[PDB]
Amino acid sequence: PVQRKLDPNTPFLTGMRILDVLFPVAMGGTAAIPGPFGAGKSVTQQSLAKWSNADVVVYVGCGERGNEMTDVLVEFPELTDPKTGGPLMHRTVLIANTSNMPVAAREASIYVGVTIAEYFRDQGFSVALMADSTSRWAEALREISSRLEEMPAEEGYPPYLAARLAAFYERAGKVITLGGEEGAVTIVGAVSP
Amino acid sequence: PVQRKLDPNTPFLTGMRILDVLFPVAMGGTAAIPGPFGAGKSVTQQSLAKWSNADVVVYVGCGERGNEMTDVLVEFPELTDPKTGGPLMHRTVLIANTSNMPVAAREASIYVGVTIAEYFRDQGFSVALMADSTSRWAEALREISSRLEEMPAEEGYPPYLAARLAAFYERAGKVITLGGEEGAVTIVGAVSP
Amino acid sequence: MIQGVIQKIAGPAVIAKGMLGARMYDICKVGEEGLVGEIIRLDGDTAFVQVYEDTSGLKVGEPVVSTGLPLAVELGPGMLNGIYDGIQRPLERIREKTGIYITRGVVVHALDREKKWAWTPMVKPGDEVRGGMVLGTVPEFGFTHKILVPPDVRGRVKEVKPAGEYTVEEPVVVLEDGTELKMYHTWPVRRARPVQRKLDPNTPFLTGMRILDVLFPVAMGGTAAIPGPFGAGKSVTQQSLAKWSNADVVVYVGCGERGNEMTDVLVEFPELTDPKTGGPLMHRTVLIANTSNMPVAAREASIYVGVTIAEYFRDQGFSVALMADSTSRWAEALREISSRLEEMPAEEGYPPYLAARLAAFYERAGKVITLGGEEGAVTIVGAVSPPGGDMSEPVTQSTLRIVGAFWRLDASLAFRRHFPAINWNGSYSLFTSALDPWYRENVAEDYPELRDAISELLQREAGLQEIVQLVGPDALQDAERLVIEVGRIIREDFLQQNAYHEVDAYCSMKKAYGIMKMILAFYKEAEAAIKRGVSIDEILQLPVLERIGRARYVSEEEFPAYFEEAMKEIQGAFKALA
Amino acid sequence: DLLKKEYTGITYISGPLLFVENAKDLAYGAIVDIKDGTGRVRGGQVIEVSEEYAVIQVFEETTGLDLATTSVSLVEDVARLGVSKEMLGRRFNGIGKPIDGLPPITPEKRLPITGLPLNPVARRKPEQFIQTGISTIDVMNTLVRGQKLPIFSGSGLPANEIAAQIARQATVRPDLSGEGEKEEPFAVVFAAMGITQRELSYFIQEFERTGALSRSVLFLNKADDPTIERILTPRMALTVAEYLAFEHDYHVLVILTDMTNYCEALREIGAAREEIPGRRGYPGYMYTDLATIYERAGVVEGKKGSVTQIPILSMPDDDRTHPIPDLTGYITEGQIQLSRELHRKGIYPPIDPLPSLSRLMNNGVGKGKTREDHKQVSDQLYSAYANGVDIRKLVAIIGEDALTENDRRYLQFADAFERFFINQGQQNRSIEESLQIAWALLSMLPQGELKRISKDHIGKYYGQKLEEIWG
Amino acid sequence: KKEYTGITYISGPLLFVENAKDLAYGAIVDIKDGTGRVRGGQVIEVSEEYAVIQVFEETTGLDLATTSVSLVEDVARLGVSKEMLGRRFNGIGKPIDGLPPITPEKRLPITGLPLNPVARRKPEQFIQTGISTIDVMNTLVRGQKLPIFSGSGLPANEIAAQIARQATVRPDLSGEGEKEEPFAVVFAAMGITQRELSYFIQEFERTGALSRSVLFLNKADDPTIERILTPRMALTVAEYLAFEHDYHVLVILTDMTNYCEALREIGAAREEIPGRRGYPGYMYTDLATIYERAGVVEGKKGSVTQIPILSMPDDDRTHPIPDLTGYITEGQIQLSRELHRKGIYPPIDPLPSLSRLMNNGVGKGKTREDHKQVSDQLYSAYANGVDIRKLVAIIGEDALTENDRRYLQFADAFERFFINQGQQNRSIEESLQIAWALLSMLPQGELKRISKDHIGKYYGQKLEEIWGAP
Amino acid sequence: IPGIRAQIRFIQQVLEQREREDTFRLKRIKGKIEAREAEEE
Numbered sequence A, B: 001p002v003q004r005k006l007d008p009n010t011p012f013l014t015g016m017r018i019l020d021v022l023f024p025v026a027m028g029g030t031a032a033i034p035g036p037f038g039a040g041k042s043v044t045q046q047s048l049a050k051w052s053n054a055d056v057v058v059y060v061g062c063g064e065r066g067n068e069m070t071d072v073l074v075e076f077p078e079l080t081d082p083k084t085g086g087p088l089m090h091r092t093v094l095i096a097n098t099s100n101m102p103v104a105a106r107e108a109s110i111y112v113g114v115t116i117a118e119y120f121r122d123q124g125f126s127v128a129l130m131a132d133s134t135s136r137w138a139e140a141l142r143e144i145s146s147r148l149e150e151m152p153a154e155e156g157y158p159p160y161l162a163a164r165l166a167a168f169y170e171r172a173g174k175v176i177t178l179g180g181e182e183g184a185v186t187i188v189g190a191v192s193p
Numbered sequence C: 001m002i003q004g005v006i007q008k009i010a011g012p013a014v015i016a017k018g019m020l021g022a023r024m025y026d027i028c029k030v031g032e033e034g035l036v037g038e039i040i041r042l043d044g045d046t047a048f049v050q051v052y053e054d055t056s057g058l059k060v061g062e063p064v065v066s067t068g069l070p071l072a073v074e075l076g077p078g079m080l081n082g083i084y085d086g087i088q089r090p091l092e093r094i095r096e097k098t099g100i101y102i103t104r105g106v107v108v109h110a111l112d113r114e115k116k117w118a119w120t121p122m123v124k125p126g127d128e129v130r131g132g133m134v135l136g137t138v139p140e141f142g143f144t145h146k147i148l149v150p151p152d153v154r155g156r157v158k159e160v161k162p163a164g165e166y167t168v169e170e171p172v173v174v175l176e177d178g179t180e181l182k183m184y185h186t187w188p189v190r191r192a193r194p195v196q197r198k199l200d201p202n203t204p205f206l207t208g209m210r211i212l213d214v215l216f217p218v219a220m221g222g223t224a225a226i227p228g229p230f231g232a233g234k235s236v237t238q239q240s241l242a243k244w245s246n247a248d249v250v251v252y253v254g255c256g257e258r259g260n261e262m263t264d265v266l267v268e269f270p271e272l273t274d275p276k277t278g279g280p281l282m283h284r285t286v287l288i289a290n291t292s293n294m295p296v297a298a299r300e301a302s303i304y305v306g307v308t309i310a311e312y313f314r315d316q317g318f319s320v321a322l323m324a325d326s327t328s329r330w331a332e333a334l335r336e337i338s339s340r341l342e343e344m345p346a347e348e349g350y351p352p353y354l355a356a357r358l359a360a361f362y363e364r365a366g367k368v369i370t371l372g373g374e375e376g377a378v379t380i381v382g383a384v385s386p387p388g389g390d391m392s393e394p395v396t397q398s399t400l401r402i403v404g405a406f407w408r409l410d411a412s413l414a415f416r417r418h419f420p421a422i423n424w425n426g427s428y429s430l431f432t433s434a435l436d437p438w439y440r441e442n443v444a445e446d447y448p449e450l451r452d453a454i455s456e457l458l459q460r461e462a463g464l465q466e467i468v469q470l471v472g473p474d475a476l477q478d479a480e481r482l483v484i485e486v487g488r489i490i491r492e493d494f495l496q497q498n499a500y501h502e503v504d505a506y507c508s509m510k511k512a513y514g515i516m517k518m519i520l521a522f523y524k525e526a527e528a529a530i531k532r533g534v535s536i537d538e539i540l541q542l543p544v545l546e547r548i549g550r551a552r553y554v555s556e557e558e559f560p561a562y563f564e565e566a567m568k569e570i571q572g573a574f575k576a577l578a
Numbered sequence D: 001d002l003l004k005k006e007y008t009g010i011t012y013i014s015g016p017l018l019f020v021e022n023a024k025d026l027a028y029g030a031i032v033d034i035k036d037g038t039g040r041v042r043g044g045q046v047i048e049v050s051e052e053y054a055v056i057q058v059f060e061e062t063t064g065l066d067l068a069t070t071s072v073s074l075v076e077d078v079a080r081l082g083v084s085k086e087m088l089g090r091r092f093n094g095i096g097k098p099i100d101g102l103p104p105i106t107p108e109k110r111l112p113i114t115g116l117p118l119n120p121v122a123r124r125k126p127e128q129f130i131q132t133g134i135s136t137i138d139v140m141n142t143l144v145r146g147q148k149l150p151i152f153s154g155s156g157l158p159a160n161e162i163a164a165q166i167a168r169q170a171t172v173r174p175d176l177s178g179e180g181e182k183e184e185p186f187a188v189v190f191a192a193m194g195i196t197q198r199e200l201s202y203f204i205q206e207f208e209r210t211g212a213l214s215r216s217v218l219f220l221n222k223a224d225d226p227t228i229e230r231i232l233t234p235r236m237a238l239t240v241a242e243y244l245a246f247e248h249d250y251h252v253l254v255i256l257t258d259m260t261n262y263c264e265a266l267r268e269i270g271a272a273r274e275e276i277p278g279r280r281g282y283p284g285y286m287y288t289d290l291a292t293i294y295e296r297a298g299v300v301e302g303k304k305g306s307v308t309q310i311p312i313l314s315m316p317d318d319d320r321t322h323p324i325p326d327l328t329g330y331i332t333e334g335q336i337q338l339s340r341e342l343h344r345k346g347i348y349p350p351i352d353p354l355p356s357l358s359r360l361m362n363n364g365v366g367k368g369k370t371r372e373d374h375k376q377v378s379d380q381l382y383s384a385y386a387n388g389v390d391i392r393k394l395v396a397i398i399g400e401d402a403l404t405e406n407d408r409r410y411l412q413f414a415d416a417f418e419r420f421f422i423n424q425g426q427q428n429r430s431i432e433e434s435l436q437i438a439w440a441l442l443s444m445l446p447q448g449e450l451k452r453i454s455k456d457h458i459g460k461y462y463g464q465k466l467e468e469i470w471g
Numbered sequence E: 001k002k003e004y005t006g007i008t009y010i011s012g013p014l015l016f017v018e019n020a021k022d023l024a025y026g027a028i029v030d031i032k033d034g035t036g037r038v039r040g041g042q043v044i045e046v047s048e049e050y051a052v053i054q055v056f057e058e059t060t061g062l063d064l065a066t067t068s069v070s071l072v073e074d075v076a077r078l079g080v081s082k083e084m085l086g087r088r089f090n091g092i093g094k095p096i097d098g099l100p101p102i103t104p105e106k107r108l109p110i111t112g113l114p115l116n117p118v119a120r121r122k123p124e125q126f127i128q129t130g131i132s133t134i135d136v137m138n139t140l141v142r143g144q145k146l147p148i149f150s151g152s153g154l155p156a157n158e159i160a161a162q163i164a165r166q167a168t169v170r171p172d173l174s175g176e177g178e179k180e181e182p183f184a185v186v187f188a189a190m191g192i193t194q195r196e197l198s199y200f201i202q203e204f205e206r207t208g209a210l211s212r213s214v215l216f217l218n219k220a221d222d223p224t225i226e227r228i229l230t231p232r233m234a235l236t237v238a239e240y241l242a243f244e245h246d247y248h249v250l251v252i253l254t255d256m257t258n259y260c261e262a263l264r265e266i267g268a269a270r271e272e273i274p275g276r277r278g279y280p281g282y283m284y285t286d287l288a289t290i291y292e293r294a295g296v297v298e299g300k301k302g303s304v305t306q307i308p309i310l311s312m313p314d315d316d317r318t319h320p321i322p323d324l325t326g327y328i329t330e331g332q333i334q335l336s337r338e339l340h341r342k343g344i345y346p347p348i349d350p351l352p353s354l355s356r357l358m359n360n361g362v363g364k365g366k367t368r369e370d371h372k373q374v375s376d377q378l379y380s381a382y383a384n385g386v387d388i389r390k391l392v393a394i395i396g397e398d399a400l401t402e403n404d405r406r407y408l409q410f411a412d413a414f415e416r417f418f419i420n421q422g423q424q425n426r427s428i429e430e431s432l433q434i435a436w437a438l439l440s441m442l443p444q445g446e447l448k449r450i451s452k453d454h455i456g457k458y459y460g461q462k463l464e465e466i467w468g469a470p
Numbered sequence F: 001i002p003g004i005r006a007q008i009r010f011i012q013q014v015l016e017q018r019e020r021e022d023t024f025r026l027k028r029i030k031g032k033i034e035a036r037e038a039e040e041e
């Protein structure tokens, strides 16, 4: 619960000229970053984590490949926070997964991450959530739906895919916490068709 | 019942150049007028109703807009019958089952219209039946079949749709009525693929 | 002897109750008429029986008795030149017994019992004998027919009848234990006949058609599939293989295909001549005919009976060819039976075990060291009939993964009356490499090189068609147009073949090698000429293209001289250009 | 048989089905009479029997039935029809009840409508040559007596007209074949399924005009008639045809008017029974069911009769991959496929030579049957027309001016072909005139490009120009 | 010991047993018929009322009066030991080479336990497969999953056997290096015809490759459940060796399309509603559990690689099997029909191929410092050459520039001397030498991608070095 | 190119529709089979 949702009146400075100037994302906003191969998505996301104004950064890997997840896990610890000069891992939370892990875990990864971000928001911080590979999460959802023998829609995805995507992307937004402070959650969800 | 079916050998002058010239339909024949939305099904059907040379015209709004029936009501009384001189409404019988009215009533509307046309045929007149949309009749059949838990054939329609359409259309034809007089019925059924 | 009573009749299926003790896949007699049927499911004390005959007119309460044995075929002398129904019932005897119509319940033995055969014993009293050894010999239409000890029999021979005339029922040999080995022996159709070893294919199965025998060969132990939409010429191709193949025995299995094809075979083959033996061609063939309107459940039985007969003749030492006329109809029969069983379909209604059944059927092919020590083989050439030409049907895709050769027919070629109508791009063959040593020793020392050159030319032509479809066939340069024209020559003068001609119907490997030599030499000289400035518009007008085109029709004996003349003419024609 | 057995205790009526509880005695495939309170009697056939109940498919609509007063009684353990020599010149409904107003026929025998398969050994090679009078059929898609040649129609093409023309003009040619001269005409068995009054009136008028009603049998199942009756009409018609042909030495020509309606009825029954559908919702056994109808044609050894078939079939979306055309093509022997493009241009009969086919042609054309040059002429015409159509497709992308002289010649040949060979109105071309026109057209191409034909025939027939025949 | 004789239903591949509460789900059972023959089976559903058993092979002799079901093992396991090297197995573990059965060191569950993401580490060393088009342009690094997409008729089996015979590690190139680093190749063939089995056995036994490889060969006519189990048994052995004896194991899965078809058949047998395009809904997770058992773990010197081989059904890249394999794996080596028909072997097309981990297994101390640039330059030059070759069929050779003619010659020389290496085994240095010789045909200064230092150091050799001695 | 793209989309939609109908029929027959099994096993 939140006391009241506010309008997007302030920006989420990502620290990169193109994004901060030509395509700004408001604090409490939502953005999508399709990731092809060789486009340096990992570097862009690490830059967002390092330099953005968000106090705490939550990274969610829904169903990433094994070795991509290994790279992710072995690259954050070496990152250096530019503000305090210490390790960046002292202000981030990593939710890791791989394709061979149980389907329920992959399906619930994004919800776990967003709930943690909401907690850190209620405290009075500004949280940046980066749900990588929401397409893999959609795959987990499809597998779960087929396990229950639901009727598919479109390319085999369950008819309620948009409902869940909205339920996840609408928890973002800057709000006045129940305690009267001000906090925000900004979601940057990748898409990998 | 009827004595003998005859061979259609006179035209059902529709008052439209293209139809009456390039693609004629005989007095006892049948015609279908498929067309996507915004093509002219409604205006074409109303033109057929207004100007055709049928002695009596039966219009069956089997699941279409109510404004169409209202337009017929509010305009036809003012117009003049080409052949009798009286108000145009005195030779038309409407059977209005708008879209938002009960679904199952569309089948009944089609059958009632064709039966009334058959009656006025038996009296010696030449009738013209304008079925506003048989796709809505097909939808009614599909819904009832779904409730019965029958097996759909294609696109969900019941397997016996072809027989029903055949029975409905075969009632058209020029005839020596049981009283000895000559009569006919013309069916111009619209389809909305 | 289990007995029960019918409880439910639904099409070709019958559910019998009181059959507690029956075994899966055992032949049961249904009703008073004793219609044959096979158990395919057991529920409580009920057995689900599929009837190999029309069940119209049956009633509930009629008796059902199980024989306790699975479907079996009588293997022995008397099968060649015959024609059989799905479950090995002679059709000439049915024709004599009933009228011109097949009728239910006829009981007729597979092998004649009243005919006497000349027996010449090979074994001697008191000698060892093992499964698959040759007891004796019996003449049959110029073949030498070997009587084999059943695959699972052992002992020492007590007494053997002296050479003389006997019937198949005579116990020619008696073992010590007391068992009597007659001139035949039953064998379950669903069990592969045991063998000693499987050999790698190293010989070609000369089908007699240039395209199949050159670009897409099939080995002596190979398996090939010939899919194609209706009208593409599957039946003509398979009949050509039956007529001209080099196999010693040809088993033709009409699994649910047009009835008139079997009549064509019966009426034609007795008049043609066997390529090798020289006697009538019908003396080397066995027909297992199950037309489309014959009972559906019998299609699987027909396929299995055919393959088992082929395996028997292999065990005798011959090399056999098995032409399955349509396996898609076998799949359809399985689908109808599954529907009657109310199972869970996969894909387009086919039961899940279809792929396993097809793999089991195909894996019986191969060259083998029979149990007797001799060497035999079985080649399976099974057609496929996808609906609407779809090569994505489950049947065709399941066949792609177990067949070593693939001969994909095309509708576009068939429309132009261009036969055999093999889509060159889609077909393939995996026996090409393993057969090279044979070609280098029995066709020509460089045959593989010419085959590869022709394939490369066709591939280049296919690559250039991508451009021709874009910028017209006249915007190309000279070399590319020459490639296109040589591709046309290859299509129209080498691959094409009129199966109804008196000479072109058959084409030995020497003839194909000669034509390939001619085309390649022409292409080499033409390319040289184009380099030096000649115009293609005049290369296509040379008077040697006519001879290259007519090279197909020259007889098999005149070909060497004609080929020498053609090569000289090629050299002369392209030398005169200066 | 003499006594009458009745089964009350119906427990279910939905669509075309009907369940009887204690019908253990009823036999699979039996025919039953359903009687309602008003006293009307309908027909039905058992399609499943068990100790608990028995399924009956009602031929006529189920209106008026009830679970209280309705009763089911047996008629015959196996469906039968009372064939007889006297039924020529009579009209019957889909079940066999006369509609011509004449009394019922005194049967000579009762035969099972389902029939029995013809023994492959007892079959005979179909050899004789039928001169359909249409050049596209006689020359390129020859029809031989004892053949199954469906006419793949379209939504609004004139398939019925072509069938009537073939029935009217079809005559065998003993003189060419060297057989004893005789003029025994064809007997027609006309099985109808869901025919609209228009087509039925057309067929009746054509038969009356040609005088074929004196020697034809009609099985009419009009569109307004019950749908499930269609499952029986083909079988009864073919039973009559086989009886006449193989017990009286008749040359019977069977015309089935719309196999698509038959497939619709079969789909209705199958879906009502929960069958595992194949493609497009049709039942999985449609292939076998259609085979049992088509494959009842052919020729038998030692009998002078012959049964020919021309099933007219309307491809739904002018689509050749629809399940009905696919199965019919896999069962029948070739097909004569009409095309819409030719029809719009005004060609009649709009037979498309390229997709058509005839698998029994080679048995009926050749030396001593029609003429020495038949097969080669047909093959060369196929090749030339195919090249013409390919060049016609090329033009629409590369422009007329770009063509060479050879391409222009082939294109002109294709046009002249479509306008002089296919298009023939209602005239009755003999085989000789058709071959003459074929050679006249082939003369347009250079002599060196007729690769399929042998040089002897080229020398003998090449040269005569089309202008001589017309203009 | 205990036999459940209460059979009450047999149909197709299933049979039911009453009073079978004691049996555990997923257990393996032995079904004994009247004649004494024994068939296998696996429980697929256990209930208070009855237990459903899926039978291996067939049910041709069973009946409800004599059939008896007895337990064999609670959960499927495989005996594993170092001695497996040099043996062959049928997919269930029973030997088929005629040698005595192995005496297991320990018995491990076949179904794999997921690796902990925090216990993995980046792939950073390369495997020299001996095929230039893979070792140079699409390197294969230890811990990578690099499927080989093929077609219906292309020679996937020959390439698989070649990689099995030639694959080796190169410890010397890594710094000071080590004298030895044990290497093994686990071969898992699923649904392969008898001909393919004879070919594989002969190829492995002909050159002593069998002395360090384990073969799990499954015939096409063998039961489908064995096909499902084969990859899992092979990967169990691979994991055992790699992570308990410090081996560098390479796993080749011969046909994943056959595995997917068997999975579909099994899913249909158990009454499961199919998902997309008729395949099981959970195919993604199953293929993940097979693929993602490879990697490199921290604190262990071993490694597991995979080279799945899948034949795209109809050359469709969007078919579910290739698509999911693409999602779960890194890269693909795509064979081409055009190159094959042209006579090139192996017919690997560098243009659509990709290796996503190449940049990590290449550089100083691993291969040579010019590897990455050489690969990039070869890719660009080949693409340009093939485009120019298409153009020449329209515009004619004379109307090209000089450099376009150079590219046109380079494309042909590349196709003939780089890809078409036949059966010869090429070390990484030889492949790089041939690459530099081919690039030398292009005019220096048009090698934009390469730095000046490398161009100076290596440019200039003659293609005749390999032509005169292939 | 847009024409071919439109045709591709149309064919994809048709095939997806057919697959969806097949799954629906499979689901209903599975329901009937489950009902029968529960009633009588």
Ligand SMILES: Nc1ncnc2c1ncn2[C@@H]1O[C@H](COP(=O)(O)OP(=O)(O)OP(=O)(O)O)[C@@H](O)[C@H]1O
Residues within 6 Å of the ligand: B035, B036, B037, B038, B039, B040, B041, B042, B043, B044
């Ligand atoms: N014959 C006509 N002359 C002039 N205007 C016409 C004619 N036919 C149609 N129109 C115009 O086009 C509009 C669409 O025609 P109409 O209402 O008959 O559509 P329709 O085919 O029945 O479609 P829908 O089902 O979407 O209503 C008409 O409202 C009128 O504006």
Ligand SMILES: [Mg+2]
Residues within 6 Å of the ligand: B036, B037, B038, B039, B040, B041, B042
């Ligand atoms: Mg409208």
